[PDB]
Scaffold this active site. Structure first.
Site, PDB file in Angstrom:
ATOM      1  N   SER A   1      -1.076  -0.708  -6.253  1.00  0.00           N
ATOM      2  CA  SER A   1      -0.880  -1.826  -7.157  1.00  0.00           C
ATOM      3  C   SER A   1      -0.243  -1.387  -8.467  1.00  0.00           C
ATOM      4  CB  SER A   1      -2.208  -2.524  -7.455  1.00  0.00           C
ATOM      5  OG  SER A   1      -2.583  -3.382  -6.399  1.00  0.00           O
TER       6      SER A   1
ATOM      7  N   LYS B   1     -15.536  -7.469  -7.205  1.00  0.00           N
ATOM      8  CA  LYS B   1     -14.714  -8.268  -8.114  1.00  0.00           C
ATOM      9  C   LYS B   1     -13.978  -9.386  -7.372  1.00  0.00           C
ATOM     10  CE  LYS B   1     -12.030  -7.423 -12.330  1.00  0.00           C
ATOM     11  NZ  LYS B   1     -10.958  -8.450 -12.288  1.00  0.00           N
ATOM     12  N   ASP B   2     -13.403  -9.076  -6.204  1.00  0.00           N
ATOM     13  CA  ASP B   2     -12.743 -10.083  -5.383  1.00  0.00           C
ATOM     14  C   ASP B   2     -13.728 -11.122  -4.866  1.00  0.00           C
ATOM     15  OD1 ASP B   2     -10.470  -8.516  -5.805  1.00  0.00           O
ATOM     16  OD2 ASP B   2      -9.918  -8.456  -3.689  1.00  0.00           O
TER      17      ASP B   2
ATOM     18  N   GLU C   1       4.301 -33.934  -3.008  1.00  0.00           N
ATOM     19  CA  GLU C   1       3.111 -33.299  -3.554  1.00  0.00           C
ATOM     20  C   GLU C   1       3.429 -32.644  -4.893  1.00  0.00           C
ATOM     21  OE1 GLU C   1       0.764 -34.806  -1.801  1.00  0.00           O
ATOM     22  OE2 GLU C   1      -0.315 -32.955  -1.319  1.00  0.00           O
TER      23      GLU C   1
ATOM     24  N   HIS D   1       0.807  -1.215   0.000  1.00  0.00           N
ATOM     25  CA  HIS D   1       0.000   0.000   0.000  1.00  0.00           C
ATOM     26  C   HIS D   1       0.844   1.270   0.000  1.00  0.00           C
ATOM     27  CE1 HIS D   1      -3.224  -2.641   0.122  1.00  0.00           C
ATOM     28  NE2 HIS D   1      -3.751  -2.400   1.308  1.00  0.00           N
TER      29      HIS D   1
HETATM   30  C1  HEM Z   1       0.681 -15.826   1.710  1.00  0.00           C
HETATM   31  C2  HEM Z   1       0.447 -15.691   0.410  1.00  0.00           C
HETATM   32  C3  HEM Z   1       0.208 -14.373  -0.208  1.00  0.00           C
HETATM   33  C4  HEM Z   1      -0.834 -13.519   0.005  1.00  0.00           C
HETATM   34  C5  HEM Z   1      -2.002 -13.702   0.941  1.00  0.00           C
HETATM   35  C6  HEM Z   1      -0.620 -12.394  -0.825  1.00  0.00           C
HETATM   36  C7  HEM Z   1      -1.524 -11.333  -0.843  1.00  0.00           C
HETATM   37  C8  HEM Z   1      -1.432 -10.333  -1.782  1.00  0.00           C
HETATM   38  C9  HEM Z   1      -2.461  -9.424  -2.076  1.00  0.00           C
HETATM   39  C10 HEM Z   1      -3.817  -9.378  -1.420  1.00  0.00           C
HETATM   40  C11 HEM Z   1      -2.003  -8.601  -3.050  1.00  0.00           C
HETATM   41  C12 HEM Z   1      -2.767  -7.467  -3.679  1.00  0.00           C
HETATM   42  C13 HEM Z   1      -3.704  -8.013  -4.762  1.00  0.00           C
HETATM   43  C14 HEM Z   1      -2.932  -8.602  -5.917  1.00  0.00           C
HETATM   44  O1  HEM Z   1      -2.362  -7.860  -6.741  1.00  0.00           O
HETATM   45  O2  HEM Z   1      -2.861  -9.837  -6.063  1.00  0.00           O
HETATM   46  C15 HEM Z   1      -0.689  -9.002  -3.367  1.00  0.00           C
HETATM   47  C16 HEM Z   1       0.102  -8.390  -4.304  1.00  0.00           C
HETATM   48  C17 HEM Z   1       1.399  -8.819  -4.532  1.00  0.00           C
HETATM   49  N1  HEM Z   1       2.030  -9.907  -4.069  1.00  0.00           N
HETATM   50 FE1  HEM Z   1       1.277 -11.162  -2.912  1.00  0.00          FE
HETATM   51  N2  HEM Z   1       0.505 -12.549  -1.534  1.00  0.00           N
HETATM   52  C18 HEM Z   1       1.072 -13.721  -1.216  1.00  0.00           C
HETATM   53  C19 HEM Z   1       2.244 -14.298  -1.699  1.00  0.00           C
HETATM   54  C20 HEM Z   1       3.108 -13.639  -2.562  1.00  0.00           C
HETATM   55  C21 HEM Z   1       4.194 -14.223  -3.220  1.00  0.00           C
HETATM   56  C22 HEM Z   1       4.606 -15.665  -3.078  1.00  0.00           C
HETATM   57  C23 HEM Z   1       4.804 -13.241  -3.989  1.00  0.00           C
HETATM   58  C24 HEM Z   1       5.990 -13.407  -4.864  1.00  0.00           C
HETATM   59  C25 HEM Z   1       7.240 -13.222  -4.457  1.00  0.00           C
HETATM   60  C26 HEM Z   1       4.043 -12.052  -3.797  1.00  0.00           C
HETATM   61  C27 HEM Z   1       4.299 -10.836  -4.376  1.00  0.00           C
HETATM   62  C28 HEM Z   1       3.277  -9.902  -4.563  1.00  0.00           C
HETATM   63  C29 HEM Z   1       3.459  -8.729  -5.419  1.00  0.00           C
HETATM   64  C30 HEM Z   1       4.709  -8.354  -6.168  1.00  0.00           C
HETATM   65  C31 HEM Z   1       2.297  -8.057  -5.391  1.00  0.00           C
HETATM   66  C32 HEM Z   1       1.954  -6.780  -6.108  1.00  0.00           C
HETATM   67  C33 HEM Z   1       1.471  -7.160  -7.502  1.00  0.00           C
HETATM   68  C34 HEM Z   1       1.099  -5.966  -8.336  1.00  0.00           C
HETATM   69  O3  HEM Z   1       0.507  -4.988  -7.835  1.00  0.00           O
HETATM   70  O4  HEM Z   1       1.365  -5.977  -9.554  1.00  0.00           O
HETATM   71  N3  HEM Z   1       3.010 -12.333  -2.939  1.00  0.00           N
HETATM   72  N4  HEM Z   1      -0.354 -10.077  -2.585  1.00  0.00           N
END
Ligand code: HEM
Ligand SMILES: CCCCCCCCCCCCCCCCCC(=O)OC[C@H](COP(=O)([O-])OCC(O)COP(=O)([O-])OC[C@@H](COC(=O)CCCCCCCCCCCCCCCCC)OC(=O)CCCCCCCCCCCCCCCCC)OC(=O)CCCCCCCCCCCCCCCCC
Ligand SMILES: CCCCCCCCCCCCCCCCCC(=O)OC[C@H](COP(=O)([O-])OCC(O)COP(=O)([O-])OC[C@@H](COC(=O)CCCCCCCCCCCCCCCCC)OC(=O)CCCCCCCCCCCCCCCCC)OC(=O)CCCCCCCCCCCCCCCCC
Ligand SMILES: CCCCCCCCCCCCCCCCCC(=O)OC[C@H](COP(=O)([O-])OCC[N+](C)(C)C)OC(=O)CCCCCCCCCCCCCCCCC
Ligand SMILES: CCCCCCCCCCCCCCCCCC(=O)OC[C@H](COP(=O)(O)OCCN)OC(=O)CCCCCCCCCCCCCCCCC
Ligand SMILES: CCCCCCCCCCCCCCCCCC(=O)OC[C@H](COP(=O)(O)OCCN)OC(=O)CCCCCCCCCCCCCCCCC
Ligand SMILES: CCCCCCCCCCCCCCCCCC(=O)OC[C@H](COP(=O)(O)OCCN)OC(=O)CCCCCCCCCCCCCCCCC
Ligand SMILES: CCCCCCCCCCCCCCCCCC(=O)OC[C@H](COP(=O)(O)OCCN)OC(=O)CCCCCCCCCCCCCCCCC
Ligand code: HEM
Lengths: 418, 98, 270, 32, 56, 47, 440, 55, 51
Positions: C96, C118-119, C162, C92
């Site tokens: 995004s 949407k979510d 797995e 934040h």
């Molecule tokens: C515990 C698992 C995870 C949760 C709950 C989580 C949750 C979120 C949420 C809610 C967002 C904002 C919505 C979205 O753009 O998808 C987000 C964005 C993001 N997450 Fe995750 N995430 C997780 C794992 C990861 C992993 C494994 C990575 C990769 C290294 C990662 C990297 C990012 C990035 C870079 C964004 C920003 C994407 C963008 O705005 O283009 N996250 N995450």
């Protein structure tokens, strides 16, 4: 320590150099580019130009100028009057080439980038507020506004409404029309004359002419009053006197030192000041009074500057003005004029002791007169001034139309007419 | 021909189908941010509306009509000189720092 | 950078959680998968065997391992919850990214009406797929041999972890050396920390980069290949396939993608 | 009136190394 | 003084302060355990297995 | 430059008061004011 | 010349002595004006709590009349020749000097001897100056920098006579009598503690003859100086009615004759100075100046090396709004630490260039040279030539700067003065912890 | 005199993260998988805990 | 890298090398002490009695 070497090039540029062999060198480029060359459409352009050194030039970036002048312990300063702008670089005598390239880039190849210019408008406000923390800055600004209609009426500071509106085009037009060779004098203390000539050859070939021919200053004779409640009242009351470099101007200098032109003795009583004694006869409140002399190329202002309590403002002003009228009535001894001449001559010789003062004197001389004269000639011009010349001069001030500027609680301050 | 490959790649990249110029698509790091901050206001406003329109287009998964596509020979590298000057200043600071 | 690095941490922690949870049923696959992947830690020089025996709480995978795995499996998802909160805190700070890769501050919308609904629809679709799995093919993504109780004296003829580990498994089975195999398996996820340093493109996203899209989908196909290969026995065709697939996996991320981005830069005259 | 401001005597709290006003406090600083 | 010397040599820099703390932690663990153990086995002399083992 | 300047420049700061005639002495102006700025020096005004 | 030949061509300060012990020192030029003065080893640090302010009072009465020149007569004489009479007082030094024409040196010298020798100290004048000095005390209250440096001296040198202000408390101003002032002059205005300096178009032989004709009466051939303990301490005067806060922080720095002064001054030039009316702003080589210009963290900051005979104040004064004091502390102390541990040669070179430029540019005009001669003979017993200052600067490098800033700054207790809206001035323990680095 | 959603310290941060947060108008379905993950996490904690009541 | 290198950065390296090696010795001693690594500890005279 060698002799001042003064030459004038075919482009009209003046170069004067004195190699005193001092460890530091000081180079000044003096230009006829004060605020008297502004008009109603570009007020404050030259104030922003004064603040605009150390911006990016064609030959060096802003970072390059700042870092490369601080690397050698050097100094870059811009000092403006209403009629002139002096750009000075001062450093040790081994680093003068670097500083001179910087100075020549600053004056001859300025870029005035739009974002750097728009990020410089805030220092107009900062700079003017710092200057206006002195109550005399705005009183002298108002005195010029009320004494003149057009040209010297212009402030050294940017109008508040013009801040954030001085454009790069105004700066470019200003430099292109005032920073020309036959309006410039390069004066180096602690340098060789051929070095300054080579410097003046590598650059300073803008037009080799007179640029924009500014208007003659027109006497107004007005009054500007600034009620602001300040504990003290600053009042300036002047008449038109004479242009600099004349017998009348010298008589006005002698008259300034007859009346009293600042204190000689710390916490003294200003015993030899006739204005101060006249005011202290009847005013038993804290006060200051001096004679004010402002000589310019085409005009001058002579009068009285008083600082007083709001309640005693009128008494101080009337006392000072009546002392001046008493000198205009032919009450002026030879001993008082000898003392005034001694004060004036000693002050002139003491002003040129410092390298800054000597450089400023040589630069202003090269601009106003296009020739250098040694202090001995200046002193004998002071000596030539007769008693009747002083008596005025005083008559011309008394009989002349008056312009007045006051600031403070002015409920007891007189008007020009009363 | 290098320009055949270049025009092929410009068509295939497909930001012209959204009405965008090349400099509209640049990743915005600190140098690029200063470059955009130094733009004249008309170019800045053109950039802002072009980008807003392209975002609006991709929100609908749509593209402009082919007549409205940026032609390869009419792509204005409007941001290139400001970026080059910003990068020159950064490089000068770093050379001083060593 | 910060949210991406938190995401890498989250990926590792989710993998640790799922690995320890899969042992909890105490079936044949649970036991022998724990056996293989814990014994992988002996390849660490000097301190490796002591580290494995300390994680075991004994000489092999047994009662101590199972109870401690239940405890770690209980506690870890709450650490993941905290890390996801920090993740969102870092996200934040910028908001995004978007598919064009261009900053969109001139076209922002409130989250609530638009992306809450949407979510929610996305959640409903995910629930649909999950419930098809749960209520129609509960065992599709599992191994029958975990319905057999664990037998330390009888190794299953196949031991596959797995499916969501198989790519890494394939990578680890590609290189004969024990320690180099483990280092490649860890690097196949730690390499995600290299993506910002390996970015040479002038554009943030691959929306306008056809050749980078080609390489991206090759990388996806190669990961699918590695998953398939890691699910297969170590035999004649699959060995060479898995070896070339692992080499391609690293050669795309570390080599092909930056050079291709540089070529794309030149094709755009920047 | 700012010249009317004197720091109060802190002798009661001072370490013995710095009770004398006539002594350099550097000569005990390291020890302190 | 001794404490001036200790500060000038070992305490002024934080890295050397930390090294002094680490070496002191090692030697303190050794000496403190030795002393505390001797106290405990003197209080409980003849009662512990060690005191009596040599009969079995 | 190398030297700090007789006076540094706080904007938005009351400078000094003058309560005595001795302090007021010398504060009246006699010559036109000049304005000076500098790369690394406090700005000054003179009267 | 190449600045090495120009330093070697600077005129030599000639020094002599009278039998009474008055030293006579002059640097001659070809200028038609001169400055000639008397510098006296007298200050507030020589005063105790009952006499504190007597020296400032005597300076106040200096030009108000002598037994030979009653009241305004002296002033008239000065004013009748175009000369300028000035005086000043510090915690250690007092000075009376005239700027005159070179042909006025005899009279000027005469005017000085009278002034130091035969001040009337008339009781009526003492009452008038009592009123003046009280009003000037209230005028000095308005100057936040003067107050913050008086506070810094008061807490750094608490319990010592160096904590005293020059003017003394207003109660002493009201209580000082003629007997107090005559005693002060009789115990401190002595020939062995005075130096008659002259810079300009002044021949040393003629000045020496003048001193032998006008000063030879003075004391021929005793309470003076105790060391002043330094204290790490803070004095915080909160006045949220003040628009800007002033903060002065100093460690104990060296005294006058300590060579460490030259590297330390170099180090201060590395930190430099700033105010919001600077051209360079964000491009300045000083890190603190560029951060202050970029973030608008302060209105000004200055480094200082105040020296007394045996100790001094080495530190920094800054002015800022209430919400930035903390930042200004953090970046300032950090710079100190960065200099103690990682000085670096190029900025040492820049600071050396700055110091040489400061030393040469300061000595421009007869008056700065006259002050240099008088104060130098009081503090060093010698005029140090600029060639020597250059030799001492040339022998400074980053190792030397690191070592001396470590010796004076690193892990040292500072003295702190805060004046104004200073709630965000950090707690003393936080500043003291900012005086060392855990990474180092 | 204030909206609780913006003034209240807990509602302030919920509001800033999930209600009044400025989000790009054009993020696609690929951006849903963040919330999905947060939902998956929650599901695993719920079912798991109810599993832990008997395991 | 290019923004790095140069005399100033090599001088900073030299300046911080004693501190870095001192922290290296601190980490070394602390790691030897926490894990009771006899491979080194068997050579420390008085600590030798603990084994
Ligand atoms: C515990 C698992 C995870 C949760 C709950 C989580 C949750 C979120 C949420 C809610 C967002 C904002 C919505 C979205 O753009 O998808 C987000 C964005 C993001 N997450 Fe995750 N995430 C997780 C794992 C990861 C992993 C494994 C990575 C990769 C290294 C990662 C990297 C990012 C990035 C870079 C964004 C920003 C994407 C963008 O705005 O283009 N996250 N995450
Ligand atoms: C190893 C020894 C420590 C070390 O090298 O620290 C280096 C460095 C501090 O170096 P420094 O040069 O003394 O700090 C000057 C800075 O400008 C920092 O200046 P500042 O004004 O921002 O902060 C001054 C002060 C501010 O005070 C703090 O940061 C408070 C420390 C925690 C207090 C308790 C919080 C509640 C629990 O900083 C510290 O106390 C040191 C940094 C924080 C360490 C926190 C340790 C917490 C342990 C629990 O801290 C770190 O690098 C932290 C990470 C490493 C820690 C060990 C792993
Ligand atoms: C006729 C059969 C073949 C269809 C054409 C496939 C093809 O070659 O290009 C796909 C065609 C071309 O893709 P694009 O418009 O250039 O880029 C799509 C955006 O990245 C993303 O644009 P979007 O976010 O508007 O895409 C929404 C789309 C795709 O949604 C997703 O991809 C997210 C769900 C996970 C993947 C589902 C794959 C099935 O949803 C669906 O197609 C499935 C609807 C039900 C699931 C919930 C959504 O894309 C689609 O139709 C979506 C691809 C996945 C579904 C098929
Ligand atoms: C259950 C929870 C509660 C348990 C009990 C809690 C109470 C006891 C624990 C805390 C006691 C107080 C803290 C003691 C330490 C302290 O203050 O350190 C501050 C100190 C700072 O104290 P300082 O500020 O007085 O001194 C530092 C300044 N110089 C360097 C100039 C002297 O922290 C450090 O010095 C950090 C660096 C050194 C750390 C140790 C390195 C070696 C460690 C062993 C080898 C490696 C493993
Ligand atoms: C078969 C596999 C799924 C294919 C889905 C459709 C597809 O990939 O279309 C291409 C799509 C285009 O997305 P866009 O942002 O417009 O990229 C620029 C295109 N010129 O590209 C994308 O949408 C790519 C988005 C990647 C989403 C995650 C995929 C990797 C993870 C796999 C496990
Ligand atoms: C238990 C940990 C120690 C708590 C008690 C000590 C403490 O609060 O701080 C100790 C140390 C020094 O911190 P400080 O004095 O703020 O100096 C920082 C640099 N200026 O501050 C620290 O944070 C030390 C960290 C050591 C690891
Ligand atoms: C991983 C989520 C963010 C917070 C929720 C939205 C804000 C909220 O709670 O508002 C409550 C509101 C308060 O009153 P409101 O009218 O908003 O006040 C305006 C004048 N200050 O509430 C009210 O006024 C109404 C309170 C009662 C509502 C429910 C009544 C029916 C219950 C069945
Ligand atoms: C995680 C850190 C590593 C933990 C490894 C297991 C702990 C361990 O073995 O500690 C005790 C050991 C004592 O030393 P030892 O291995 O017996 O070798 C002596 C040879 N003469 O100590 C060690 O082996 C310490 C080794 C530290 C890790 C390498 C550096
Ligand atoms: C990060 C979230 C979680 C993941 C990815 C996860 C994953 C798994 C997996 C893969 C299994 C083996 C499933 C099988 O039998 O085939 C499992 C089992 C189990 N999990 Fe979780 N789990 C998570 C959270 C939790 C939490 C928070 C708890 C405890 C409150 C929990 C309790 C259990 C229990 C008791 C079992 C054993 C019973 C069973 O096999 O279903 N899980 N988990």
């Amino acid at each position: 320590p060698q002799d001042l070497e003064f030459t004038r090039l075919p482009n009209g540029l003046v170069i004067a150099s004195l190699e005193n062999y001092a460890p530091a060198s000081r180079i000044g480029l003096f230009i006829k580019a004060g605020s008297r060359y502004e008009d109603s459409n570009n007020l404050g352009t030259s104030h922003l130009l004064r603040l605009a050194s150390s911006l990016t030039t064609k030959g060096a970036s802003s970072f390059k100028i700042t870092r490369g002048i601080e690397a050698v312990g050097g100094k870059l300063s811009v000092t403006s009057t209403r009629e002139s702008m002096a750009y000075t670089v001062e450093c040790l005598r081994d680093d003068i080439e670097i500083l001179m390239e910087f100075l020549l880039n600053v004056t001859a190849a300025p870029e005035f980038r739009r974002w750097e210019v728009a990020a410089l408008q805030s220092q107009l406000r900062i700079d003017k507020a710092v200057a206006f923390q002195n109550p005399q800055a705005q009183v002298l600004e108002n005195l010029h506004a009320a004494a003149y209609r057009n040209a010297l009426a212009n402030s050294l500071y940017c109008p508040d409404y013009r801040i954030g509106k001085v454009t790069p085009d105004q700066l470019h037009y200003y430099v292109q029309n005032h920073f020309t060779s036959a309006r410039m004098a390069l004066i180096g203390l602690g340098v060789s004359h051929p070095v300054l000539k080579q410097v003046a050859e590598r650059f300073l070939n803008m037009r080799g002419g007179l640029g924009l021919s500014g208007a003659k200053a027109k006497y107004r004779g007005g009054e500007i009053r600034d009620q602001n409640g300040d504990s003290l009242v600053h009042a300036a009351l002047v008449a038109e006197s004479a242009a600099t470099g004349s017998a009348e101007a010298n008589a006005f200098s002698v008259l300034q030192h007859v009346l009293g032109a600042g204190p000689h003795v710390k916490r003294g009583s200003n015993a030899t000041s006739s204005l101060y004694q006249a005011v202290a006869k009847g005013v038993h409140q804290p006060f200051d009074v001096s004679a004010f002399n402002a000589s310019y190329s085409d005009s001058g202002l002579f009068g009285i500057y008083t600082i007083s309590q709001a309640a005693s403002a009128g008494d101080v002003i009337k006392s000072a003005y009546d002392q001046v009228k008493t000198i205009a009535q032919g009450n002026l001894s030879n001993t008082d004029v000898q003392a005034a001449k001694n004060k004036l001559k000693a002050g002139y010789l003491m002003s040129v002791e410092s390298s800054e003062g000597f450089l400023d004197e040589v630069g202003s001389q090269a601009l106003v007169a296009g020739s250098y004269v040694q202090p001995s000639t200046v002193l004998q011009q002071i000596d030539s001034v007769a008693d009747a010349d002083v008596i005025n001069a005083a008559k011309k001030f008394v009989s002349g139309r008056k312009s007045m500027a006051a600031s403070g609680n002015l409920g007891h301050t007189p008007f020009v007419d009363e | 021909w290098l320009e055949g490959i270049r025009k092929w790649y410009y068509n295939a990249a497909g930001f012209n189908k959204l009405g965008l110029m090349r400099d509209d698509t640049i990743y915005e790091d600190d140098d690029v941010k200063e470059a955009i901050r130094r733009l004249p206001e008309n170019l800045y406003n053109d950039r802002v509306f072009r980008i807003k329109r392209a975002l609006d287009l991709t929100m609908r998964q749509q593209i402009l009509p082919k007549e409205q596509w940026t032609k390869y020979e009419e792509d204005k590298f409007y941001l290139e000189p400001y970026l080059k000057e910003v990068i020159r200043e950064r490089k000068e600071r770093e050379e001083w720092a060593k | 950078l910060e949210t991406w690095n938190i995401g890498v941490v989250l990926l590792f922690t989710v993998m640790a959680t799922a690995f320890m949870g899969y042992v909890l049923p105490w079936g044949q696959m649970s036991f022998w998968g724990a056996t293989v992947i814990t014994n992988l830690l002996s390849a660490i020089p000097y301190i490796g065997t002591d580290l494995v025996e300390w994680i075991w709480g004994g000489f092999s995978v047994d009662k101590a391992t199972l109870t401690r795995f239940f405890a770690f499996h209980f506690i870890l998802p709450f650490i993941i919850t905290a890390l996801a909160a920090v993740h969102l805190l870092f996200l934040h700070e910028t908001g995004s990214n978007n598919p064009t890769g261009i900053s969109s501050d001139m076209d922002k919308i409130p989250f609530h009406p638009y992306y809450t609904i949407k979510d929610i629809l996305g959640a409903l679709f995910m629930m649909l797929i999950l419930l098809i799995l749960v209520l129609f093919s509960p065992d599709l993504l599992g191994d029958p041999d975990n319905y057999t109780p664990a037998n330390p004296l009888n190794t299953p003829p196949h031991i596959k972890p797995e499916w969501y580990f198989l790519f890494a498994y394939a990578i680890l089975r590609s290189i004969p050396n024990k320690l180099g195999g483990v280092l490649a398996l860890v690097a196949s996820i730690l390499i995600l920390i290299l993506m910002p340093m390996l970015h040479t493109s002038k554009q943030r996203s691959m929306m306008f980069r056809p050749l980078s899209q080609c390489l991206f989908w090759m990388l996806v196909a190669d990961l699918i290949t590695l998953t398939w290969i890691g699910g297969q026995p170590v035999e004649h065709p699959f060995i060479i396939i898995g070896q070339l697939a692992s080499i391609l996996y690293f050669l795309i991320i570390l080599v092909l993608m930056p050079i291709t981005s540089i070529i794309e830069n030149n094709l755009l005259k920047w | 009136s700012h010249t009317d401001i004197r720091v109060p005597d802190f002798s009661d709290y001072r370490r013995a190394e710095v009770l004398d006003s006539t002594k350099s406090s550097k000569e005990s600083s390291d020890a302190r | 003084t001794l404490t001036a010397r200790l500060y000038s040599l070992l305490f002024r820099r934080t890295s050397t302060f930390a090294l002094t703390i680490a070496v002191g932690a090692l030697f303190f663990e050794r000496a403190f355990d030795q002393g505390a153990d001797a106290i405990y086995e003197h209080i409980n002399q003849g009662k512990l297995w060690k005191h009596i083992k040599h009969k079995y | 430059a190398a030297l700090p300047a007789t006076s540094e420049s706080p904007v938005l700061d009351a400078k000094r008061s003058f309560l005595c005639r001795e302090s007021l002495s010398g504060q009246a102006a006699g010559r036109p004011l000049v304005a000076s700025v500098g790369l690394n020096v406090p700005a000054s005004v003179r009267y | 010349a190449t600045y090495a030949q120009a330093l070697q061509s600077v005129p030599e300060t000639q020094v002599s002595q009278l039998d009474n012990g008055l030293r006579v020192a002059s640097e001659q030029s070809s200028q038609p004006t001169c400055t000639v003065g008397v510098w006296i080893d007298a200050g507030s640090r020589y005063e105790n709590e009952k006499n504190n302010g007597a020296g400032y009072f005597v300076e106040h009465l200096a030009f108000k009349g002598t037994k030979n020149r009653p009241g305004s007569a002296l002033e008239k004489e000065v004013e009748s020749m175009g000369a300028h009479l000035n005086a000043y007082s510090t915690r250690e030094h007092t000075a009376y000097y005239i700027k005159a024409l070179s042909k006025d040196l005899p009279k000027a010298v005469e005017l000085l001897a009278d002034i130091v020798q035969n001040c009337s100290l008339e009781d009526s004048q003492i009452e008038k100056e009592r009123d003046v000095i009280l009003q000037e005390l209230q005028e000095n209250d308005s100057s936040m920098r003067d107050v913050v440096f008086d506070y810094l001296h008061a807490t750094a040198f608490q319990g010592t006579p160096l904590a005293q202000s020059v003017e003394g408390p207003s109660e002493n101003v009201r209580k000082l009598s003629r007997a107090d002032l005559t005693e002060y002059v009789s115990q401190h205005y002595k020939a062995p503690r005075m130096v008659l300096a002259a810079a300009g178009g002044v021949e040393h032989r003629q000045l020496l003859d003048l001193a032998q004709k006008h000063f030879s009466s003075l004391s021929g051939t005793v309470p003076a100086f105790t060391p002043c303990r330094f204290t790490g301490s803070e004095i915080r005067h909160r006045d949220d009615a003040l628009p800007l806060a002033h903060v002065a922080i100093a460690v104990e720095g060296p005294g006058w004759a300590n060579p460490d002064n030259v590297p330390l001054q170099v180090a201060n030039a590395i930190i430099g100075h700033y105010d919001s009316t600077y051209g360079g702003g964000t491009h300045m080589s000083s890190t603190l100046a560029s951060v202050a210009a970029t973030r608008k963290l302060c209105q000004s900051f200055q480094t200082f090396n105040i020296c007394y005979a045996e100790t001094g104040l080495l530190g920094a004064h800054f002015v800022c709004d209430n919400m930035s004091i903390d930042d200004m502390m953090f970046f300032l102390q950090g710079q100190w630490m960065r200099l103690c541990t990682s000085a670096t040669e190029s900025e040492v070179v820049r600071g050396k260039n700055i110091l040489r430029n400061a030393l040469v540019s300061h000595l421009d005009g007869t008056t700065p040279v006259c002050e240099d001669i008088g104060r130098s003979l009081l503090t060093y017993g010698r005029r140090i030539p600029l060639a020597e200052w250059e030799s001492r600067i040339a022998e400074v490098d980053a190792s030397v700067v690191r070592e001396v800033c470590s010796k004076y700054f690193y892990d040292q207790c500072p003295a702190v003065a805060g004046l104004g809206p200073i709630e965000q001035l950090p707690d003393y323990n936080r500043i003291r912890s900012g005086m060392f680095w855990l990474r180092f | 005199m204030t909206n609780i959603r913006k003034s209240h310290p807990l509602m302030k941060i919920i509001n800033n993260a999930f209600i009044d947060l400025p989000a790009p108008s054009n993020i696609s379905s690929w951006w849903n998988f963040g919330s999905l993950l947060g939902i998956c996490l929650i599901l695993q904690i719920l079912t798991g805990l109810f599993l832990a009541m008997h395991y | 890298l290019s923004r790095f290198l140069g005399p100033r950065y090599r001088e900073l390296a030299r300046n911080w090398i004693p501190t870095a090696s001192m922290w290296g010795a601190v980490g070394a001693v602390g790691l030897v002490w926490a894990t009771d690594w006899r491979l080194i500890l068997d050579w420390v005279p008085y600590i030798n009695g603990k084994f």
